[PDB]
Symmetry: D3
Subunit: 258 residues, 6 copies
């Protein structure tokens, strides 16, 4: 890999860590980088030892956005071509949980990439923003959708129309991120979180993740019916039986992913 670095972490290497490694362009997400990222994601998704994935960048930047230089001379017809900014949402197809550990800059595509993850942990100095408007364009990877649904209309409108950045504290207060940690312990805290998740049944975890994601795709009435079906279906797994036995039997549960 020329733009990313990967390694297994956790107690039993149950955690997959992906680090964007293109320091020069503040981790600008060029087409090649996305290519590798999707590869890394796929390998971890296929590895039956990995139960969760952690995504992070540098200390100064998570990602400053997509590569502006690569899209400077593209056309409207270039957009309906199919080779312009494709595969950006492959991460939304990963069944396993993905935690974004954000230190420093998370702008444009960078902020959008973090929002595509299931959980976001931010470093004390992290900064989020959607500056697309300053470049004469608008967010094109969920910046007007995921952001608005987490932060509320007023703050989303202010961010998208002005291009202003918000601090990690503001992001936590608004619900964009769920935890803030010191710059130097961020990635570690993220890994510990991934570890807790990796310890649970992989099949049950995948169902829970689907259920939560469904909250943004249907009415509450139907969302609850779907959730109920998923709940019922867990009763067809062995881990559910094992899990509830471990409780009454007041012992630790040992899930075997099925």
């Amino acid at each position: 890999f020329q733009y990313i670095i990967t390694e297994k972490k956790g107690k039993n290497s149950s955690v997959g860590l992906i680090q964007l490694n293109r320091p020069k362009a503040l981790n600008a997400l060029c087409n090649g980088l996305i290519e590798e990222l999707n590869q890394a994601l796929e390998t971890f998704e296929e590895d039956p030892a990995v139960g969760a994935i952690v995504l992070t960048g540098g200390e100064k930047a998570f990602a400053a956005g997509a590569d502006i230089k690569e899209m400077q001379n593209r056309t409207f017809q270039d957009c309906y071509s199919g080779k312009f900014l494709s595969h950006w949402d492959h991460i939304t197809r990963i069944k396993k949980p993905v935690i974004a550990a954000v230190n420093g800059y998370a702008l444009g595509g960078g902020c959008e990439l973090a929002m595509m993850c299931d959980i976001i942990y931010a470093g004390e100095k992290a900064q989020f923003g959607q500056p697309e408007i300053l470049l004469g364009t608008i967010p094109g990877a969920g910046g007007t959708q995921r952001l608005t649904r987490a932060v509320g209309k007023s703050l989303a409108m202010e961010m998208v129309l002005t291009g202003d950045r918000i601090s990690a504290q503001d992001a936590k207060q608004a619900g964009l991120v769920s935890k803030i940690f010191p710059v130097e312990t961020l990635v570690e805290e993220a890994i510990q979180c991934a570890e807790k998740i990796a310890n649970n049944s992989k099949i049950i975890v995948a169902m829970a993740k689907e259920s939560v994601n469904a909250a943004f795709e249907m009415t509450l009435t139907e969302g609850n019916k779907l959730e109920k079906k998923l709940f019922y279906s867990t009763f067809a797994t062995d881990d559910r039986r094992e899990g509830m036995s471990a409780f009454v039997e007041k012992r630790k549960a040992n899930f075997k992913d099925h």
Copy 2:
């Protein structure tokens, strides 16, 4: 009742109070408890003197969830028998406002029961969580739906996939609960809130509640049209004439629930 204690309270016994009373199992919501709860709710719903209902538990626990021992040996087929965990959402059918006064633990079904209520007040030491994942199952009573819609994706994912609990402070900050009070004044503050509601027209209050609930069942454009129709319909009541006349006449309004 064996598992609950009821009693009218407030200004004119206009507030119905229901207290989960099964101390030994940290208020675990077994089938029998749910049975009584729905009875209590129905009586208060039918009592024309009661304008609001307050739901609370013990000081150490609101409810630690459904009874794990009652579902430990059930099956997938049992889920479709229609005899497994039935009648849990009867509370969502109550027309009158219901306030949850949460002290201590509010886990799994407990947290979900609180979220089914219209308003939530938490004690300084309250704790919310969805630990279903630790038992090899997922939330099955709105934990992946109502939670996500209030708290945002990141925190909802973190809570549901790890099983970690959050404090009352975190819950208020995230919008899960609207007010925090000292452990010993919680139930009273809740009752005072129920009292303000009980003082308003019961027919107008029921319409307002429906309108707010509709916010999670349709697009904003349609939600506004529905709200408009409801607003128009209030002009067919006497209390609306009495209320707007009491303002211009600089006097107290006397609603006749008509």
Copy 3:
């Protein structure tokens, strides 16, 4: 104008400022006031020099609601004649960004008017509320819809069913408003915000605003597809090319709004 005061305050006269000026009724929004407001909005919308609009009231009150005296003797039939409280949502049709600078009271229709704007800035002493329930009626201009989607069910239910007001601090914490400023610098800070927006391409800004508003009208999956189409379409403008080229050339760039 007999109820409003207008003027262009931009540093380059690019911000349209509208001030509700009916001090005696705490800016109660009577039919005549709404008439002028829509006129003011339309003129600024048509003025190619104005890129953003700021809406504010007095120091003691933004607006205490619609005029109660004008609706106290209306009937149900009156409502369906389409000549009662009509034209209240013309502001939602304005394509240019609208910032609400709220000082003091913002109740009922006043709170709803603020929520119709794209961004809300509140003064340290601002107060929001939906006291309709106290008059024997319910919010009829989005108070049960926009409020709930920004603040969460619990707080929305509490506000709408009790009629209690919330402070500016609470509003910011809940996500109702995005910034709090001292009473005397509020309008100025709002204007500065409008200025930043006015500096961006008007055509790109209009698209960004549409995309954000779409977040409340469709599922996330479709919202993202819509956003993508809008993003593609920006590649058919000159300001986009000028905006990206300006970046790689380390030079500022101003758009000709096309």
Copy 4:
């Protein structure tokens, strides 16, 4: 029962037949009739021998609507009493399939009752209509919703705004009913259909019914995701194994309902 006749005219006694029996008022559905209908439905729903239910009326009329005499002296407040025209949609909660065998008149509430069923068979002389408009009211049991979704806007608008009736032929052509039979063989044909359904696994049939109903409650994208989950869940039943094995073994399948 004074208004209905129930008898297991099924063959293996697996089909429950309910016949509206109030000849004098052309089967006008008064409160007492609905009362019994819901009872009959519940008993069959609980009877493990019954796999499907057939609903029919007289030869001249299925049902001429709700009892007009019973609602002539009601008021707006009455509607919000919580119980005026209640329990009119209990049939939509029955998990087993329900076939409506419609002979003669099916007007207003009668037409709506038929549309609430899963399948509709009409006699050659059947007539459908929503004459509510002629009584100075509108359909209030799905007549503007289920009708429109089956028949299309133009025909639904014409039917609802004029009150005109349509023939069985028109109903089949528009998709309101799926089959037309001679007046004297209608009920039998309906029973034969119920029989085919009753022969399949009750648990699988219940899932299939839910999936089809979901088509009117969510987007196609989510509808397909839900359907997929239900499909997967069938693999946790025994009947699904028996059913596919019976095909490969080229023999008849014996479903045990689990």
Copy 5:
């Protein structure tokens, strides 16, 4: 009017007739024509004597679409900040029922105009189609939305992607139109239909129309709740009292429109 003809044609002037009169361009809907159309619509909407509106064109053409010559040189820019092809959906805002009497050609904007109406009657020689694709563009006034919802995906796709026209018979079979009449009696039959509608309460009719239109804006569950609220609200009118009484009194009803 330059390209329009209007006249009250009811037996009491209860029916407003609008006839597109631009023979030379096969009734091509140019900007000027749309202007007058919206005026005509508004006058009839305001006339308390008119209860329904009938819209028709010539015998050879209803409308061949929007004026192709008027949009030939316009560009992307013209589309955003433009009154370009504006006010085309004013007809969807009319509260009173609108019947489209279609003889001959109804293509592109013409077909779309017809679908915007509540009811469509077609002459034996009427032809519908969306040939936009042949001009290198797509339907932009509901041709891919209303058509699909009435006719089904297969026929809508075939019509939109090939540009092929369908006959009146095909349109009736598919549910696009609800009635076919001889070329000479079409307009007359349409007027008779408008008459039946005009005889009913104008306020109840407007509610029924809203309810039916809601069927395409929300889930079935919410659609039914909305319809129920509208039904309830009819009990606050006098005409509902009159209508139901006239039935029990076995006598004709006289609606006062309130």
Copy 6:
């Protein structure tokens, strides 16, 4: 290719033909067959000479469903494995139009495959059905969703719950298919249809197809707004001008796919 046969059949070789060729199992769609089908689809999608794709099978069968023998011994966990009946909806991702030419049997997965296509042409002897229920399972590839939306609740429920087949005539009347042709000329008529489509601008056609598909993914109000944005965007293409000038200049259309 071991199970299919691909061919270029346009008048300019602009039509891609794919023929399922596994006669022995009545074209049962086994995993290998789906593999090739997706390959064939991808090649045609990438070939800039092909403007439309035609999908057909044998004269006796289009496809009898997925391979029952390949799923006979699979588990619930096999479903959540990640690769059981995978890649079945790749066809819904193809941007180019796809016509299904159905002769003979089109059951289960076969019927669902046909419904995934944009247009369906059926031979006089074609038969459609969803017999999954007879195998102790339910439709899992859109059979309860796409079928219901095209055919209506009654017929969809009857088909899915009984397993009964319907004729080509019934399918056309219900809107499932848009045209019926003699068994011998079916594929040829389908190709002619594909040809007409292939003659139009590829980029405009792709947009029209997206707009029609959006009709099942959002409310009518939003669907129309989306359509309008797509319509506007066509004004940024050359084919739009070429097409609109070709009409005004009374000459034949000149397309260049951009």
